[PDB]
Amino acid sequence: GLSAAQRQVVASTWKDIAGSDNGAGVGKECFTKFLSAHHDMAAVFGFSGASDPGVADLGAKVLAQIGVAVSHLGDEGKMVAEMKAVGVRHKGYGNKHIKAEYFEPLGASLLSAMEHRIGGKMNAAAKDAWAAAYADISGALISGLQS
Numbered sequence: 001g002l003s004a005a006q007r008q009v010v011a012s013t014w015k016d017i018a019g020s021d022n023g024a025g026v027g028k029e030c031f032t033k034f035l036s037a038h039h040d041m042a043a044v045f046g047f048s049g050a051s052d053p054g055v056a057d058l059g060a061k062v063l064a065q066i067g068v069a070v071s072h073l074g075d076e077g078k079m080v081a082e083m084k085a086v087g088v089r090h091k092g093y094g095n096k097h098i099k100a101e102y103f104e105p106l107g108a109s110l111l112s113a114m115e116h117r118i119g120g121k122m123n124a125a126a127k128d129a130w131a132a133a134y135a136d137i138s139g140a141l142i143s144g145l146q147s
């Protein structure tokens, strides 16, 4: 759960993270750094490696989905219901054995890619609130995945 203050710094910094490309660039960097660090993850996604054209594609779709989750943070039941639906779709994605443990390393890569973009605006308060926001968004996706 996010506090009112955490919801506010997440909604505020998302404007800068989204940039003029709806976070597409942040997505490309997150997924390229993640798969370069964990080569074993390429197969879970069905990618050939970090250079596969699909990582820039999927990176834009993930960041665009985080953007609609950010627009619904004020209604928790709404945000978790729609992230559960995304999670239910993941049962049939990649190697079809996506595991809950894979989400915490992905989170670290996302927060670094966000910081890379926004610089000093991703301060300690922004990082804690985005860590809390990533915990709820992926947590709701995992619930759908395990349903």
Ligand code: HEM
Pocket (backbone or CB within 6 Å): 044, 045, 046, 058, 061, 062, 063, 065, 066, 086, 089, 090, 093, 094, 095, 098, 102, 103, 106, 138, 141
């Ligand atoms: C390490 C964990 C994850 C894995 C292995 C994974 C894997 C995949 C794969 C393989 C696809 C491509 C499906 C296709 O070919 O159409 C996909 C699509 C998608 N993923 Fe993930 N995903 C993960 C985490 C996430 C997270 C954290 C989000 C949260 C926003 C997310 C959001 C999406 C979206 C929006 C799509 C596009 C299709 C749809 O809306 O269902 N994924 N994911």
Ligand SMILES: [C-]#N
Pocket (backbone or CB within 6 Å): 058, 059, 062
């Ligand atoms: C998930 N991409």
